[PDB]
Structures are given as C-alpha cells and as structure tokens.
C-alpha cells in the first residue's frame with residue numbers, strides 16, 4: 205500500500221482495536237479504485253486462527269445494501285415497481301391498513317412504523333402473515349422513517365416473487381455471481397465453515413440465530429476481499445457488464461426521502477460530501493439511528509449523487525461492520541470485526557481515514 | 563432493404579401519401595437495430611427538388627423529445643433536480659401561484675393549466691416574465707395534464723441555466739454532437755438551406771415563424787438519417803458513451819404520470835406494449851384535452867416493453883416517431899404537410915406490428 209494509506213490505517217484502526225477490545229478485524233481501503241487490505245488478530249480465539257483475506261464475517265444490517273441492490277435489479281428487469289402496492293405481490297395481505305403501503309415504503313422504512321424486529325416468536329410463513337395482517341401503523345404511509353428489519357425484510361421477500369426464485373437463489377445468481385463475490389453467503393456451506401469467524405459477545409463465541417426474514421435484513425456473511433469488490437461495484441456501477449445490475453446499483457443510491465442531512469436509498473443511506481463528521485458520527489448512535497424522524501418525499505427521486513458519503517452500519521450479537529464510500533473520489537472503506545462495538549467509533553475511524561485520503 | 567420491409571412500407575405509405583395529398587415524405591424503419599430509408603415526392607414543388615435522405619424537415623413538437631433528453635442530461639450532471647421549485651432557477655417569478663410548481667410539473671404539463679401556446683405578443687424575456695407572473699392556474703400542481711408549449715418550453719429554458727450555455731449551445735454540445743446528429747438544427751445555417759424543404763399549408767410554401775421558447779418546444783429541423791440515429795439512441799441508450807447523456811435518455815423515458823393508458827415521460831410519451839392500436843390511434847387526435855393524472859410515485863424507470871412515441875406539427879409539416887425498446891424496432895415519418903395525427907399513428911402501427 206502507499207505509505208500514506210498504511211500510516212493513517214495503522215494510526216486509526218490499530219488503536220481502535222485496543223480501545224474496543226476487538227478480537228479480530230479486517231479492513232479494506234479502496235483508493236483511486238484499487239483495494240488495500242489490513243488484518244489484525246483472530247477469527248477464532250481458542251484455535252488461534254488468524255483473520256485472513258478469506259475470513260467470513262457476519263455483515264449484520266450491511267446486508268440491507270445487498271437487498272436494496274437486488275430490489276433495484278428486479279425494478280430494472282421490469283419485474284417490480286416501487287409504486288406498486290405491497291398486496292400486488294402478497295395477495296393474501298388483505299387487511300385494510302395495507303391500503304396505500306407500497307414497495308417504496310417497505311424498502312425505505314416509511315410504511316408508518318413497522319417494528320424494528322420481526323418478533324422472535326414468528327417462525328412459520330403462517331406466523332409471518334398473521335404478524336403483518338395484525339400490525340397497526342403508528343403513522344400514515346410516507347410520513348415517518350423508522351428503521352426496521354420487518355420493513356426492508358418484507359421488501360426483499362416480495363421483490364423476488366415475480367422471478368419465482370427463492371431470495372437466496374436470486375441474490376446468488378443476480379448479485380453475488382455477476383460481481384464474483386465467490387466467498388459471500390446467506391447460508392455458509394460446509395466448505396467455508398473453517399473460514400467462518402466466530403463472533404464474540406460477553407467473551408462467548410456466537411453466530412447469528414435463524415430468524416424470520418433474516419436473509420433479507422441481516423443475514424449475509426462475507427470476506428474483506430468480496431466486500432472490497434462490493435464497494436468497488438457500488439463506487440463505479442458503469443463498470444458492471446450486466447445491464448440490470450448496473451441499473452439496480454444506481455437505483456439503490458437514488459435519494460427517495462430526506463430527513464435532516466441524510467437521504468434514504470434502497471439499503472444505502474447518503475449525505476452530501478463534504479459531510480459534517482459530527483453528523484454521521486452522532487447520527488449513527490442508536491438513540492438517533494433507530495428513532496422515528498419525519499421525511500420529505502423527493503419527488504421524483506434524485507439520481508445517485510456522485511459527491512456523496514454513502515454508507516451503512518451493521519451488527520449482529522457477535523459482529524460489527526461498517527462500509528462507507530464517496531463515488532466522486534473513487535474512495536471507500538470496509539471495516540469488519542468479530543465484536544459488536546459502538547457505531548460512532550466505527551464512523552469516526554472511517555471518517556478519519558477517508559478524510560485523510562481524499 | 564429486405565423485400566418484406568420494402569413491401570410493408572410501400573403498401574402502407576403509398577396510399578397515405580395519395581389520400582392525404584402529401585407533397586414529400588421520408589420514412590426510416592429501424593429493424594433489429596439497422597436503418598432502412600424511403601423517400602417520396604418533393605421537398606420544393608416550385609424548384610422540382612425531390613425529397614432525399616439529406617432533406618431537412620421541421621420536426622415541430624417532436625422537438626420536445628430533444629428538450630426532455632437535454633433536461634434528463636442536466637439532471638444526470640447534477641445541475642438541476644426535477645423536484646427543484648421553478649423559482650430556484652427564476653427567482654423573479656415571485657407571484658404566489660408559483661409556490662409548489664416544480665421543474666417536474668413544467669416538463670410534464672402538470673403545473674396546473676399553463677397554456678398551449680405562448681402568446682404571439684410575448685417577445686422579450688421581460689414579456690415572458692410578465693406572462694408567467696400574470697398566469698392564473700386553473701388547478702393545483704400535479705393534478706391535471708394539459709399539453710402545453712409554454713410548460714415544457716419554460717422547463718427547457720430553465721434546465722440549461724446552471725450550465726451557463728444558451729439552450730441552443732447546450733443542445734448542440736450535449737446532445738446533437740455526441741450523437742453525431744450533424745444535420746440537425748435549431749437554426750438552419752445558410753450552407754444547409756439548399757436541403758431545407760418547404761412546408762405546404764393550403765398549397766402555399768411556408769416555414770415555421772420565430773416565437774418565444776420556439777427552440778425548446780417546436781423548433782428543431784432534421785434529416786431522416788439523423789432522426790433514425792435519434793431513434794437508435796433512444797432504443798439503446800446503453801450504447802452511448804457519454805455517461806450523463808445515456809442517463810438523460812433513460813430519465814426521459816421514465817413514467818412520471820398516468821392518464822388512461824398513457825404515461826408521460828420528459829418529451830416522450832409511452833404506453834405498454836403490446837398496445838391496443840385504437841388507444842394510440844384515437845389517442846393522437848381536440849384543441850385542448852385536460853385530463854386528470856395519477857402520480858407514479860416514484861417514477862417507473864424506462865420500461866423496455868413500451869410503445870414510446872411523439873407526434874409533431876408545424877403549419878407546413880407533420881412528423882411522427884415511435885419505437886419499441888424490447889423489439890429493437892422503430893419508425894420515423896417526416897412529411898411537408900401537417901395531415902391528421904391518427905393517419906400517422908395508424909401507418910406506423912401497421913408497419914411496426916408487421917415487423918415483429
């Protein structure tokens with residue numbers, strides 16, 4: 205790596221790991237379009253297995269960026285429209301509160317207060333229909349953004365209905381394969397288990413538990429190499445050969461709603477660059493990031509803005525992830541750890557690094 | 563051309579020219595991506611000059627397709643947003659009816675009843691300001707569509723302000739040049755007058771008159787070759803090398819509003835394909851039809867299975883362009899008489915339906 209990349213990464217990430225007591229960490233910096241990789245510590249503390257370029261980490265809510273782009277691709281294929289009623293694709297969802305809730309509201313957490321989590325007790329398809337049929341909204345559609353796994357989770361499940369493919373099969377064949385993400389999985393197969401990091405929570409080794417709509421909201425596992433490729437793809441979508449995927453990545457960075465200084469994409473969130481770092485740093489703390497906020501519709505949505513900070517945080521019980529990039533600067537960063545440590549500390553580190561390099 | 567293309571075109575266009583008494587016509591069929599050209603009759607009856615592939619015709623309102631694409635390319639550049647208020651780009655528009663009227667409303671005829679024509683007495687840009695300030699909407703913004711040159715014409719004018727270029731210069735540098743439309747003009751240069759057809763209105767030779775926002779709403783002249791290249795560009799925007807233009811073409815074919823079976827783009831109008839030919843044939847015809855619109859929220863990106871089209875007339879010319887992206891199929895009809903729109907649509911549908 206150029207010395208200026210090594211110096212700012214070492215000075216920022218290495219101390220963060222000490223401060224947060226992170227067992228293992230991989231970071232990619234994309235600089236003038238090319239990836240540079242850094243690794244620390246252990247994937248599995250008991251085995252003393254080092255983090256490598258092949259180590260798979262739980263991306264947690266970073267998965268929503270794959271879901272947003274898979275939906276973007278289905279729109280480009282003309283299979284779905286974000287203006288369509290949710291009930292077009294789930295004809296069994298007939299209760300009256302759903303009138304007026306569209307795929308756009310599910311994808312952007314604006315349906316009117318669908319809950320942060322799908323309840324743990326929901327296990328079957330039948331449980332899931334009953335939970336949505338029984339949900340009562342806190343606000344009208346398209347008035348309030350409330351971050352919610354049960355919102356974008358349902359979007360992803362419905363987006364793939366026209367294709368007839370399972371969500372996993374659509375994600376593999378339409379997104380992971382065309383981008384050569386060859387070590388990225390919704391369900392880690394036996395061959396990859398030896399590379400699958402353990403997460404650490406209260407010192408115990410953990411992996412995420414099965415949950416309804418887990419694949420669509422928080423279920424992707426990936427390596428630092430494949431996430432570097434994912435950043436590159438989202439930095440420069442016109443390089444992607446497959447027309448509908450190139451389109452889908454562009455649609456996932458369109459600005460659909462504005463709250464404060466952020467804009468909501470499909471999975472991705474965006475702010476103009478240069479950003480106020482205190483804004484993304486404080487905004488990432490869960491007391492703000494999970495609060496309801498009033499949205500202004502952006503009518504029609506602004507196409508992807510090059511001069512943006514585009515980012516997403518993600519956590520599972522044992523893992524904490526962050527991805528951020530600025531298309532205009534051909535610059536990005538991926539940070540994967542096998543401990544769930546506070547968001548502001550991720551955003552602050554990533555900001556220090558990217559701001560040094562632009 | 564392949565004998566089947568030849569035969570469908572000639573058995574359609576021959577009787578059209580006879581029945582409508584058209585003095586000169588040029589047609590291009592785009593079939594599997596490649597252009598095939600046909601020409602008939604006279605560009606200049608008095609001078610006995612035939613229509614050729616280099617004859618310029620007035621496109622009339624087909625010019626709005628170039629204005630919608632130039633707008634789409636300005637949005638792709640980040641210079642404007644369709645969600646911007648009009649007053650952002652013309653802050654002298656202080657009259658209170660302008661609050662809430664966006665560039666999207668201007669581009670799609672939904673501002674609330676701006677009129678079809680800018681009145682003839684509007685010359686200067688101060689007369690133009692006074693016209694817009696004094697205009698009284700019939701409706702709230704985004705509730706009814708009323709086709710209007712004064713609506714998309716102002717959109718064209720404002721969309722280029724951040725660029726710092728004249729509308730003509732932006733159109734030249736950002737659309738005509740990149741697409742090698744080198745015989746397409748807002749103002750026909752002296753060197754190209756020998757190729758400018760006359761239009762014919764009641765047997766008299768006529769050309770379009772200057773008027774305010776003419777360039778933006780109805781003032782482009784072009785050849786059948788350059789119009790075939792325009793149709794190719796709109797059929798396959800992914801082949802275009804300039805990234806903002808490729809995107810601008812896509813934005814112009816997004817579906818912003820629905821009324822009946824038709825969707826409004828930026829300049830272009832679209833229907834799902836296959837189309838009921840009655841929907842487009844009668845649909846193309848009335849001096850004012852005000853139609854309620856449903857917003858497409860958010861707009862649908864350009865749908866490949868569409869019949870995408872635009873009609874156009876000036877006092878002496880009648881033009882039509884239609885294409886179907888998923889079949890790589892298109893047609894351009896240019897004539898130097900303004901004959902009824904249903905006759906245009908009917909011919910076009912009878913040709914393209916036969917070729918797919």
Ligand SMILES: *C(=O)[C@@H](NC=O)[C@@H]1N=C(C(=O)O)/C(=C/OC(C)=O)CS1
Pocket residue numbers: 264265266320353422490517518519520521547
């Ligand atoms: C995605 O990461 C998702 N959690 C998935 O398991 C979101 N991120 C959170 C976080 O940043 O920590 C969430 C914490 O939720 C709480 C504190 O209840 C949940 S939503």
Ligand SMILES: *C(=O)[C@@H](NC=O)[C@@H]1N=C(C(=O)O)/C(=C/OC(C)=O)CS1
Pocket residue numbers: 622623624678709711780847848849850851873874875876903
């Ligand atoms: C463009 O062609 C424009 N005339 C410009 O000089 C419009 N042309 C019409 C037409 O195609 O005949 C118009 C019909 O008006 C309606 C009701 O759409 C509008 S003026």
